Point group: D2
Chain length 297, copies 4
């Protein structure tokens, strides 16, 4: 199969279950919403080695937010609902309560799990807390130096998906990166998904375990490394390919991960010099969710 002359390999991405909380952050302007959302979701590329897996889902319009202010939806992800609450508390308390002009609202109002993060945050006000109602929502006011920090009582969390992905093979590093850049921008327009790696993009890649250093949990997949492809006789890097980037995608449900993969791939293949689109998996042996590339189109 080819889109724009670019081979889409008949394979699938293997994705795992993960606990995902959705938080709406509003602020005085877009810039300040984005500043807080970025800080809150930093140091969160992969939960296998980071405190969490987090990122920006989409920009929120003034027309859809409880307070009518510009905002940013973020997702924060961990394996356990407990470590998720701990992350919501450390990240929202230390990076959003402390950020200029922010309010936090529940991104998953209908979720069965509801961590009472707004409630727990109010105590920082040390007696000066207030309770008010924004658009039918139970919100605590927390007087701080800037004014009132507004936090809705609960943050919703569900079981979603981590590790939907696709690989971009390019003739040069900057060809592949530009494809990846165009893919992440498109996915950042879509609801339900995040791309937790730096700028949304995996530069490294990974195989489970190791060949030489068996103590390590994960290592570079030598078969996807362009610079050593002539030493690696089962290499996935052709002679006309000099770089691969991967886009890792997390999301609330299967259909939102698929929409992100489809849109991202179609954006990626618009860059001249892209040689192949593929995806990473583990055989069917680990991940429950399997996104077949060909079924997207």
């Amino acid at each position: 199969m080819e889109i724009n002359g670019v081979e889409i390999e008949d394979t699938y991405a293997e994705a795992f279950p993960i606990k995902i909380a959705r938080v709406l952050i509003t602020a005085a302007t877009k810039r300040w919403a984005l500043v807080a959302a970025t800080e809150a979701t930093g140091f969160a590329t992969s939960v296998i080695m980071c405190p969490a897996e987090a990122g920006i889902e989409r920009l929120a319009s003034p027309s859809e937010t409880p307070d009518g202010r510009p905002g940013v939806y973020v997702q924060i992800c961990t394996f356990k609902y407990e470590a998720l609450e701990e992350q919501l508390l450390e990240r929202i308390g230390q990076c959003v309560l402390t950020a200029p002009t922010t309010a936090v609202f529940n991104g998953l109002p209908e979720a069965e799990k509801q961590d009472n993060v707004g409630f727990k945050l109010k105590f920082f006000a040390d007696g000066m807390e207030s309770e008010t109602q924004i658009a039918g929502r139970k919100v605590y006011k927390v007087p701080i130096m800037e004014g009132d920090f507004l936090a809705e009582e609960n943050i919703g969390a569900i079981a979603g998906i981590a590790g939907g992905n696709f690989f971009i093979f390019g003739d040069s590093q900057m060809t592949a990166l530009t494809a990846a850049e165009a893919a992440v921008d498109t996915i950042a327009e879509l609801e339900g998904t995040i791309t937790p790696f730096p700028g949304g993009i995996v530069a490294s890649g990974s195989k489970s375990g190791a060949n030489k250093y068996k103590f390590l949990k994960a290592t570079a997949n030598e078969r996807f490394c362009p610079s050593i492809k002539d030493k690696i006789e089962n290499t996935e890097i052709p002679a006309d390919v000099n770089a691969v980037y991967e886009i890792v995608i997390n999301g609330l449900d299967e259909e939102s991960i698929k929409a992100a993969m489809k849109a991202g791939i179609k954006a990626a293949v618009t860059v001249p010099g892209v040689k192949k689109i593929s995806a990473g998996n583990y055989g069917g042996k680990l991940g429950k969710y399997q996104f077949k590339l060909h079924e997207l189109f």
Copy 2:
């Protein structure tokens, strides 16, 4: 004392000792160096509940970096040296090694303390690592999907200073915030200092204890909360002030913190409506370093 008509309080900032590692992240472009530096220094506003205290010190010119490429100096800070090496490993490994086009060099090369982060990261290549020399510096090549990730053997660290600061009182929220924004942009031009809070800016503030919820080691200082200044009879907030922002400054030495406080204050008072500059201290009974505002000028 007034600067530009703005009252400068005759007080001082109270700063604590901290461990600081300086890292240079280079990348293909300014934009990719900033993506990596930001991801790597997020979720790190305060070591008192974040994994670290971190931020961007200043942009690196292509004319000054080991590889002649655009870069960003970051500082990652922590109380104990053991925790720092750990934070360096996790933040550079998960947020820079994985980020597009990045190389990591030692920000504090002549420093006495050195963490061998590059040596430790090379193991990711699983036998495929190499060793090269960039501008006299010892560097490890780690083959990954995009190409080769370059990481200098060591990252230096020193005994630095956290918690230098000044307060900005404004007639309105956006007056005080714009003043803070101008101060943060100014400080980001300066070598040796960072401003670890979201956007460099503290919206919250805090006192050392609690009047009510004694199970909290720190709460909002109600004396600097404008939205409740009428029900707080020992309020530090004038009737014509509606918002206060604080800029916290970590740095390598005392001279750099002072340069940052001075430049930041001088930029802040250029914003019309700013009423007063102050600073936060703990009676002199908590931190070794005293930065007196009037001695800056």
Copy 3:
């Protein structure tokens, strides 16, 4: 009427007829599309002394463009169609054809007036030009140093509207500006409208003619100048207002100008410190279109 506690003055904006060409600029990434769109719509705040009035209407998703690439819709506006065609030729030929990775498409394909800029631009190729179809659209290929510049044959123009507007009265300059910024960002999300002033925002304001220098086409309206409100008997600036910003909106039809005004106003009034919303007209006897604020809600 009050929205969010801010007085909406019972008045109207007086808008004029103007010719508007709509152009879609696609590029390799959002960033490059924005670079070209920004260069091409610069020096174009008011046709009363600029070669045109022009701006960014809104970003284009890869999912909606003819080539599947990210894009930006811009509007270029003049009083006469003939001046519009020169501006299209000069602005596109010199700021888009020369800009990295761009393609131009017709933003008003179903319009009666069609300036064949694509045809005219093909002659830069000097014999080496070609023809194609992108998405059922007729496109000329112009070989240049970067690759092939693609330009659809025609660019559609209509009789649109210039000078929908509202004024934001704030307690400080940064209160009023932040309100304006939030409004411009909201309007930049909306189809059909641009905001041609720098950053979308009018800091100056004007009245027709003069009191003193009668040889001038326009001068500052002393009535809306806060810094001299005490030396002007007929001042429109309340004692509690220290700054006003205006947002000018050009647009394709009345529906889209009303939507922009409504949306921009609802965003502006979310900033604490905003005292009044108003609009500027000329007494009903210079403008063809009158948009009354109270009708918006």
Copy 4:
């Protein structure tokens, strides 16, 4: 000659004399200074068909500006001083006087030619204008909606140089463009130079005259068009090069243009896949100036 393994052609850039005016635009923050600087220097890639050649020379620190505020130095260029004064009045009057929070100061205070743009702009105030002194400079206050617009009396100008340049040959479009991006960010650090094309970068290129359409002053140089290199017996495009980008540099003197050419090339050649650096000239038979590439190093 090679730098970082990239062949530098023994050729020269051919540059022409041009009038250059230097202007300092300050504002409340970097962002607002950049907005105004950008609007004022847009639609100004080439004096050939644009009303001017203009661009951002470099950002100004709060520590170096007359008012202590962040700023941006811009250059605006025409062939005759007659056209220049018109462009200063029109670009500054329409794009800077109208822009949020800006003030303007003379960027060339010692130049012999001094255009009295501030004097002329003050008439906008219609009798309400006044005179003040900022850091020893004669400045006019023009009351407007936002507050007071401050404009220094004169803007200096000199006979400078337009059309210093170099070409970047890449293996792919995005390789060449990333090298050009890196080059332009570097030159934006340097005093005395601008890069007037969109985002600093020339995607088109040109030869004097035409092979076919002789009614044209300039056409695409088919010898540097990679798209059709197999159709042009005369091609300067190697088989392994797929895209060329040019950086055009205007500047105050030869030395500052040389420095930008040098720093630009040294940044360009850090991007993997760059094949060759060159420059554009006109046989030596059109321009007073000739910058030899090999003589830069």
